[PDB]
């Protein structure tokens, strides 16, 4: 596959600036995947040190965004549950 | 232990309390005569696994212990003339449960620390926060009266 980044401006109601880029090309096969190389296979690839692997998980996954309001308390147990109960690095 | 300690911490038996918790953890923790570190070192031994119910559990009371001892330590050091040491423990108050009446009072307390040091513009911060979050904004306006007295803003003082 080859990759296209399309750009368009919003401000100008002329549709004037409809640039692109050809941003490279992705070669792939079972010989490559059979040796991992682009996969993420869990727990051995716990220590995330090529950030594309982090970026892959933040692209693939089902994102869900929330507000938490404690209006007659302050809210700090987060970090314990995160760090202690959930055990976050 | 939590409940016992609440009796001893309602009844000013802090020497016996720290002794109890020294016994609980390793007695190698013999020299940590500060409570505020022993209370944190004290680890509830489960997430309270499928046993009978409770109205409250070890952690939920530890969280009350730490905030209550911090508040008490703070007020004693403040009145005793250490509006330097207060600031540490009065930050440990807000960092852990602070029901908003506990925050209102922690903030008046920090206004008082800074006014006694001669830092009026910091004190004003904490006092405006206490005005906002509180339903009883007597003690902050009192602290403000005393601030404008310290300075000489007698019109501001009188209006406060």
Curated annotation (Swiss-Prot), chain A:
Q: How does it assemble?
A: Belongs to the multisubunit FA complex composed of FANCA, FANCB, FANCC, FANCE, FANCF, FANCG, FANCL/PHF9 and FANCM. The complex is not found in FA patients.
Q: What is this protein called?
A: Fanconi anemia group B protein
This chain's function reads: DNA repair protein required for FANCD2 ubiquitination.
Q: Related disease?
A: Fanconi anemia complementation group B: A disorder affecting all bone marrow elements and resulting in anemia, leukopenia and thrombopenia. It is associated with cardiac, renal and limb malformations, dermal pigmentary changes, and a predisposition to the development of malignancies. At the cellular level it is associated with hypersensitivity to DNA-damaging agents, chromosomal instability (increased chromosome breakage) and defective DNA repair. Some severe FANCB cases manifest features of VACTERL syndrome with hydrocephalus.
Organism per entry? Homo sapiens (Human)
Where is this protein localized, as stated in its record?
Nucleus
Swiss-Prot record, chain B:
Q: Where are the TPR repeats?
A: 104-137
Q: Where in the cell is it found?
A: Nucleus; Cytoplasm
On the tree of life, the source organism's domain of life is Eukaryota
- What tissues is it present in? Highly expressed in testis and thymus. Found in lymphoblasts.
Assembly behavior: Belongs to the multisubunit FA complex composed of FANCA, FANCB, FANCC, FANCE, FANCF, FANCG, FANCL/PHF9 and FANCM. The complex is not found in FA patients. In complex with FANCF, FANCA and FANCL, but not with FANCC, nor FANCE, interacts with HES1; this interaction may be essential for the stability and nuclear localization of FA core complex proteins. The complex with FANCC and FANCG may also include EIF2AK2 and HSP70.
Give the disease association. Fanconi anemia complementation group G: A disorder affecting all bone marrow elements and resulting in anemia, leukopenia and thrombopenia. It is associated with cardiac, renal and limb malformations, dermal pigmentary changes, and a predisposition to the development of malignancies. At the cellular level it is associated with hypersensitivity to DNA-damaging agents, chromosomal instability (increased chromosome breakage) and defective DNA repair.
What role is this protein assigned?
DNA repair protein that may operate in a postreplication repair or a cell cycle checkpoint function. May be implicated in interstrand DNA cross-link repair and in the maintenance of normal chromosome stability. Candidate tumor suppressor gene.
This chain belongs to the protein called Fanconi anemia group G protein
- State the organism of origin: Homo sapiens
Q: Which gene encodes it?
A: FANCG
The shown chain, on whole-protein numbering, covers: 143 to 302 of 622
């Amino acid at each position: 596959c080859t990759v296209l980044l399309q750009i368009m401006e919003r401000e100008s109601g002329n549709c004037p600036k409809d640039r692109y880029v050809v941003c490279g090309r992705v070669f792939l096969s079972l010989e490559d995947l059979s040796t991992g190389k682009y996969l993420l296979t869990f727990p051995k690839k716990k220590p995330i040190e090529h950030m594309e692997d982090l970026f892959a998980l933040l692209a693939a996954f089902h994102k869900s965004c929330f507000q938490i309001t404690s209006p007659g308390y302050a809210l700090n147990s987060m970090k314990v549950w995160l760090l202690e109960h959930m055990k976050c690095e | 232990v939590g409940l016992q300690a609440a009796l001893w911490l309602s009844a000013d038996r802090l020497g016996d309390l720290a002794l109890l918790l020294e016994t609980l953890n390793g007695s190698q923790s013999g020299a940590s005569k500060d409570l505020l570190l022993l209370l944190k070192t004290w680890s509830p031994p489960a997430e309270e696994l499928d046993a009978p119910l409770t109205l409250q559990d070890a952690q939920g009371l530890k969280d009350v212990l730490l905030t209550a001892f911090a508040y008490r330590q703070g007020l004693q050091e403040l009145i005793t003339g250490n509006p330097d040491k207060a600031l540490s423990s009065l930050h440990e108050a807000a960092s852990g449960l602070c029901p908003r009446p506990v925050l209102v009072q922690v903030y008046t307390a920090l206004g008082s620390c800074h006014r006694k040091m001669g830092n009026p513009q910091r004190a004003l911060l904490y006092l405006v926060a206490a005005l906002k979050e509180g339903s009883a904004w007597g003690p902050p306006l009192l602290e403000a009266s005393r601030l404008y007295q310290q300075l000489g803003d007698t019109t501001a003082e009188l209006e406060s």
